[PDB]
With several copies, the nearest count.
Chain A
């Protein structure tokens, strides 16, 4: 049950910011429930797969592109240069959104929202969800920071150990030849003694 909260500025009331909450089960294509609130009143509407398909057919384009545009507009996924205008008639509870392009505009979508008798409940639910996600993200960040610190400490320790071992390698390389020389010299001294005894 994915959810996304965004802040928009209706053209009718540009002095205040409204909150649009879009909730979908698996993907935006299947359908989604949207809720527009302003801290005092809330309007909730639903869009199904049939409505999205009909809108895409009317606008005469592939479903994928329409879904991408809807994601960019409603979910606040707009690119560096993408202006979307949201209009909402409160008397008729008609909420539509369009894409502005230079001197032309495209009526991207429209829905008919209905008022909810208890905006307080939905406002409280939204605030509680926001607080819960904030807490979860904070806990995840703390855990990641702890893991990073542990990894850094272990990496430093292993680096020091490798620094010691790389020199120990050459130390052993040098020591082995000297040891071999000593033992071989002793054996050759025994050989010389035996040869002298034989000569005698």
Chain B
């Protein structure tokens, strides 16, 4: 239940807020599955309730997320895939500042 109060949105869709564009990622799908297994909340639609964002090696969408978060009242955080892996390995929530 470590990720109970930390909702995570993953860049598994080429176009945001569009279910018809599901990607065939390899690491991303497994990481999302594990994160939801550990109690995290994963939403296919990016709404105002999103608090954390996970992006893989694809750095092309970083600018899009940085532009979107400006309009959002609460700005989310973009974290690398290493944060969740380290959290599972150490069995506690690592600080995101080292993976932002």
| B36 contacts A159, C-beta separation under 8 Å | no
Which residues of chain B (1-42) have a CB below 8 Å from chain A? 26-27, 29-30, 33-34, 36-37
Taking chain A's interface residues, is the majority helix, strand, or loop, or is none over half, making it mixed? helix
Residues in chain A near residue B36, CB distance under 8 A = 166, 170
| A169 contacts B37, C-beta separation under 8 Å | yes
Cβ of A158 within 8 Å of any chain B Cβ, yes or no, is: yes
- Chain B, interface residues (CB within 8 Å), range: under 10
- Which residue from chain B places its CB closest to the CB of A169 in the assembled complex? B37
- Which residue from chain B places its CB closest to the CB of A159 in the assembled complex? B29
Q: Give bound CA distance, A169 to B36, whole Å.
A: 11
- Closest Cβ of chain A to B91, distance in Å, is 10
Q: Which of B26, B27, B33 meets A166, CB within 8 Å?
A: B33
Per-position binary interface string of chain A over residues 143-184, scored 1 when its CB falls under 8 Å from any chain B CB and 0 otherwise: 000000000001001110111011001100000000000000
- Closest Cβ of chain A to B73, distance in Å, is 29
> What's the tally of chain A residues with a CB closer than 8 Å to chain B?
11
| A161 contacts B26, C-beta separation under 8 Å | no
| B33 contacts A162, C-beta separation under 8 Å | yes
Residues in chain B near residue A166, CB distance under 8 A = 33, 36-37
Residues in chain A near residue B34, CB distance under 8 A = 161, 165
Q: Give bound CA distance, A170 to B4, whole Å.
A: 13
| B33 contacts A163, C-beta separation under 8 Å | yes
| A158 contacts B37, C-beta separation under 8 Å | no
Q: Give bound CA distance, A157 to B30, whole Å.
A: 10
- Which residue from chain B places its CB closest to the CB of A151 in the assembled complex? B26
Q: Give bound CA distance, A162 to B37, whole Å.
A: 10
- Closest Cβ of chain B to A158, distance in Å, is 6
Residues in chain B near residue A163, CB distance under 8 A = 33
Residues in chain B near residue A165, CB distance under 8 A = 34, 37
Residues in chain B near residue A159, CB distance under 8 A = 29-30, 33
Q: Give bound CA distance, A169 to B33, whole Å.
A: 12
Known: A159-B29, A159-B33, A161-B30. 17 other contacts (CB 8 A): A154-B26, A154-B27, A154-B30, A157-B30, A158-B30, A159-B30, A161-B34, A162-B30, A162-B33, A163-B33, A165-B34, A165-B37, A166-B33, A166-B36, A166-B37, A169-B37, A170-B36
Closest 4 CB pairs of A and B: A166-B37, A162-B33, A158-B30, A154-B26
- A binding-site residues for B, Cβ under 8 Å: 154, 157-159, 161-163, 165-166, 169-170
Can you show 18 pairs from A to B with CB atoms below 8 A apart?
A154-B27, A154-B30, A157-B30, A158-B30, A159-B29, A159-B30, A161-B30, A161-B34, A162-B30, A162-B33, A163-B33, A165-B34, A165-B37, A166-B33, A166-B36, A166-B37, A169-B37, A170-B36
